Amino acid sequence: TCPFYKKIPGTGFTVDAFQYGVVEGCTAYFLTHFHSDHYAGLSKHFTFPVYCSEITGNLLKNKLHVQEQYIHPLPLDTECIVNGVKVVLLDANHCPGAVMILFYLPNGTVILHTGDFRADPSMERSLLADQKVHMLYLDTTYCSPEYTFPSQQEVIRFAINTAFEAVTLNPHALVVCGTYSIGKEKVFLAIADVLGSKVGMSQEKYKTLQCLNIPEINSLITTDMCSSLVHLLPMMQINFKGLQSHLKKCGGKYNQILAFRPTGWTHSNKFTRIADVIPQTKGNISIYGIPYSEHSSYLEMKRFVQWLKPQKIIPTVNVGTWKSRSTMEKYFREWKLEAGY
Ligand code: NI
Q1: I want to staple 341 with a disulfide (CB 3.0 to 4.6 A). Which of 215, 245, 275, 309 is the partner?
Q2: Angle at 280 between CA 209 and CA 171, to 5 degrees
């Protein structure tokens, strides 16, 4: 049955609640982004109204074959009316098409659901600045002070310089990047751009990327692997065995692989700076784990909530254990006492 933290009080609305069958009293189903833990349950047989971004609507239509008449895409940063309630969709700084949703309840309560997000000071200048929020449904993925990670910009600088160096030293090296969902496209696109190559990938992945409105994408991606020296493979194939096999398939065009695994966090963060990151190497294969996150660090999360000053916080992640929930509630009290709301 549907958890309480997916239900918006005083409305007929749910958020990211497609795996519970017909939810009692739900008149409109919102989808924050196209990740499987959130969309699980949608298909061509869904016949309730789904409200989402344009990009998410493209992916529903083309990848899951949801019928167009049930997809209701909304423009960002625009006041819209849904079943009698004003809503706004804001950029979540997550994966392409990912949104936060502001709901303006008829009784005067204002609710922000972040979906999945990476908090940023840029958010302090959207339509959030203009009114008070009473309740915050918060992505608490990394809600503990051990979770520090560098900016996206520093991580991409490290990747570009590493790949450019390796291929300049050996023009017969192949670069491989792992993927399992949309998100983190900057990793493989920035590398291809510095090498003057397109990114080669499966037809299924190319189709997924064509749904995303990324400008000049026909310019950076391709299904012709033979013309490309940056290849995208499933994340599960980013290991020594999987990569030895791929290299066999390239028919002696290449004699070395440098591969990247963009992870969220890994405990090498508590000790090591990005500058200090080293690969695992075996033979002519090296694998770098890089801490490219599309969720808030602890400090970014803290800053956002201390700026927003909500009256109540409802966590949406790590809610399944009493020790996690207690930990989070303790941090929320600290933040409130330190900031004075
Ligand atoms: Ni997500």
Answers
A1: 309
A2: 65
Ligand 1 is an ion; residues with CB less than 5 A from it: 35, 116
Q: How far is CA 14 from CA 54, 158, 264, 304, in A?
A: 19, 40, 27, 24
Rounded distance from Cα 249 to ligand 1 centre (Å): 33
Please tell me the distance between residue 56's alpha carbon and the centre of ligand 1 in angstroms: 12
What does the alpha-carbon distance between residue 259 and residue 243 come to, in Å, rounded to a whole number?
Answer: 8
- Look up residue 283 and give its two tokens: 């033979």
Q: How far is CA 60 from CA 46, 54, 205, in A?
A: 11, 10, 15
Structure method: X-ray
**Alpha-carbon distance 49 to 42, whole Å?**
12
Out of 3.50.50.60, 3.60.15.10, 3.40.190.10, 3.30.70.1350, which CATH number does the structure's domain 1-147+296-341 have? Answer: 3.60.15.10
Residue type at position 230: V
- Write down the CATH number for the domain with range 148-295: 3.40.50.12650
Distance in Å, CA 78 to ligand 1 centroid: 23
- CB-CB contact of 204 with 187 (8 Å): no
Gap between the Cα atoms of 334 and 332, Å rounded: 6
CA-closest candidate to residue 261, choices 283, 286, 241, 284: 286
Q: Give the CA radius of gyration of the chain.
A: 22
- Sheet harboring 110-113: ordered strands across? 80-82, 85-91, 99-104, 110-113, 135-138, 312-315
